[model samples]
Target chain A: ELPQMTQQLNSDDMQEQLSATRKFSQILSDGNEQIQAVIDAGALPALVQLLSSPNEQILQEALWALSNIASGGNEQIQAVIDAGALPALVQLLSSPNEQILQEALWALSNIASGGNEQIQAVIDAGALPALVQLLSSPNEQILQEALWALSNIASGGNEQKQAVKEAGALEKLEQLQSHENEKIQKEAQEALEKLQ
Target chain B: ELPQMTQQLNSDDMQEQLSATRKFSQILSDGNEQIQAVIDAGALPALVQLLSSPNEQILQEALWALSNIASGGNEQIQAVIDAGALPALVQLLSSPNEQILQEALWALSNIASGGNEQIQAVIDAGALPALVQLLSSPNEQILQEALWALSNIASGGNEQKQAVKEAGALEKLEQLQSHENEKIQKEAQEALEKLQ
Candidate 1:
């Protein structure tokens, strides 16, 4: 169904690749028929494949597509999960590229927002360590997104929140309590309130 | 089943209310049986009622809770829509309280991000004018969220995106695309691309 969708996925042109992935993401981000089209096309593997792209723009768009797919109901999340996107997404947490890191955080945040199995998958894929470290990043976007992911983790279960807390997130958040950014300060404080 | 969670929503201390509301939202955002827990506890009306609280902190927290509920999926988003929250949330877009405005935009954004029917409901509630007005806000958070909501509208369908474009959102977004803040800039540009 989306045959050309994959052709563009492997394109050498970043612009063309980004456009295709973004277009694919809109459908993936939507519901029902929107979801069915992508599933029927077997889009998960091509999407997860782009995680290895040399450019953050491609990686960012790729993550957005996967995140949108993950945003759908369980079957959609399961598609991406079964495609082995989790470990690939987790690897980007260590990316030196801020955009990749931010988008990666967004994808995982939505994944963590899913059911117990999906949330546990992200946790087990080892997203906790980098997420806590990013909590203290100088980049506000990365910090806010990292916090967003952790907040979802906290919501996943008491054990997940405890994992974040024990990973030193609570302590990292303690310093951010005084950070200059209002949302950062508030989000960190809120996470502390939830994680504890 | 979740009486303490609902009770904590109206606690005398704003801090207490914030924590309670944030945790409740984490659960609500998870959807499934958790959302059913909220409805069974009569928490929907309690949350909607707090939309008018004099405290910005309380209002933000209340909106945040409902935002998560809306994010939970159609049934949950429909619950917030049915609770008369759409109008209240749209009204708060004009709130002098920046925090309240941001949270309101965030909540409305989630609603708009839901199904086609939900998108139509927010549009019918008179969200466009306020959403377009908030586009020029100096506050990046408000600007960022307002653009996000508008983008979701743009993402809704051609008619809705046309409404945003016809509302002068395109012109306003042109100015916002030059926004110094990266998120605001990127979101504005993304909305422009989608609308065009």
Candidate 2:
């Protein structure tokens, strides 16, 4: 039954595939061991495909699933990285849809936390400049998440900090320490402290 | 009628006095004309009394009223300054209530805009340290207003700037420039620019 469902999820019809993608993404978030087994069985290709779906909601769900999978550790991290996910995720940062842009930055942040290889992937894919742009935004939530991502990237090494600095992130981060939200201030401080 | 209302606004009954004070404060926000009348009617004493009110809401309204009056220019500015309002407003900075603290800082910012004498009063009343302490506050609005007040005071002259520097505001302002908000970034930039 699981194999049948997994096969059906990859069907030719785009709408049906999107629906199945949402369902599978929710299952991944279910925290059930059986669900993990299903995730382990065959969810990766479908998730990668769904990430490119024209339907943004479907793409968002897939990105979230990828974030969760990537967070599980090394194998899932390498899987998404190998699937050419970084460029696509970086492309979404330029999205006019604030939610999609936010989710993209968030997923990149999560990936950056997975390890050095994933952080390098994000840097190579040109995510830093877009993230730095959001840092100077008037929107507090966007600023916080962008700072979080930059901080994670900066956590890896001096090269990562230089990448962020070359992208003009250090100046932006330095500017954000005075943010109105206490959490942002703390996050800015933590991120800056890490970089230094 | 104005004198009677002012006297009633200072009545011992907390609720009635609060209500009357609120009515008078609201008049300041109605328009420049009503604000001018409130200032002309010698509303400073009652406004200052309301600043010490235990009711947070009343204090906010009073501080806002005082801000408007101070912004009305020389005579009104002198009235608020002479009524001994700066000390109470400065003391309110340490208030546990965030709203009152923010409004108090905003009121100080407005009064500080009245020029060098008011800036000197702020300095004489020992507002520099309180203003500097708020630079570390988690609340962005409070911190921005506090910075603006400090900036206004600092812009008054070398003495004012030196006072702020002695109070350790330059380091705090430098820290604020790293804040996530662009408005804060610009304000911090302006503050730093002034000092240089």
Candidate 3:
């Protein structure tokens, strides 16, 4: 469906917001163009705001929507950041819900994929400690996303890499290098090398 | 086992050379310190020469050994290049054997992971066409290695990225964005974005 939910995104009713966000996220999964369109339809700010919702399903949908939006080109990513998505997304990293943690991690990773400033936004938003912690998560999906987000940050300049190290990711990454899962091992190794 | 095979790497008997190269590659698999030891033992030149061997086993083992060497730090990677491994490794891309092709691709990818000069060396060695062609390969291992090499090369400067685009990789990579394999799809998308 076309994103015809801008008003509904701001609806007072929690159910209305959740319904609209779910539909928006489904459209976002269509990829970059749909992501851009949803952002253009004025969903980004509301989505970021929904990251604070006490409603678990709304928070998940918003994180998923933001992750998709962040996957767009540089300008679109900036739009998401300018709309204040970083701190909220970083906070969600500590969520008890695995899906929220994974989605938040994914959104930050996409944002980190941006230029140095966007990566710095992630670091300054206090993502590193949570990210390093998630590296030790028993959930492979959480573990992979954490590695991806950290590697994306480490790919920046010396200061960015230093922040990652200062957050104590090195030990966790070293441990993960011998992880049983091949993908985890590969991600851990890639992340460790970039940190160097 | 220790790498005590520099003399054997230079032997007249093909079996001796093959056995020595295989053992050297096995030692190299132990990681960075072992790789440095293999290079320090003066096995590099002999290994480069063995890359041209008419015997398939010797060539395969030589490629594997060189790939491991290239996985080392910047100076160690330069040692492999300075030993004149690039041309032979690139030449091996056309080998009919899958193992040889994969090893060659892995070696070039490792070299490409070096600084701009090293990456330019691979590009200048005429690796583009074979690499782009391999992106369409049905063999997942070959396809993954090819993507890795191209992605590493694409991570280089504007000239390097331009060379990759000119070699007709963009179309192949765009096609690969929808690849059935998740890893390939991720690799292709990352490479494409870097080229942008």
Which candidate should be chosen as best, given TM-score against the real structure? 1
Interface RMSD of 1: 22.9
Cα lDDT tens digits, model 2, B105-142, are 87777677653556788889988999999988888878
Which DockQ values do the candidates obtain, in the order shown? 0.02, 0.01, 0.01
What are the chain A TM-scores of the candidates, in order?
Answer: 0.78, 0.75, 0.79
lDDT of 3: 0.72
Model 3 chain A: lowest-lDDT 10 consecutive positions: A25-34
Q: Classify candidate 3 by CAPRI docking class.
A: incorrect
Top DockQ model: 1
Give candidate 3 misplaced runs (Cα > 4 Å). Answer: A1-196, B1-34
Worst 10 residues of 1 chain A by lDDT: A25-34
Put down candidate 1 lDDT per residue, B1-196, tens digits, no spaces: 2446445444455555445434433332333333355544445565576677654554555566666566644456778888899889888888877777777787787777654457889998989988999887777767778887888787655567777876789789888766678777777777787777
Q: Which stretches of candidate 1 lie over 4 Å from their true place?
A: A1-31, A55-58, B1-196
Name the TM-score of candidate 2. 0.41
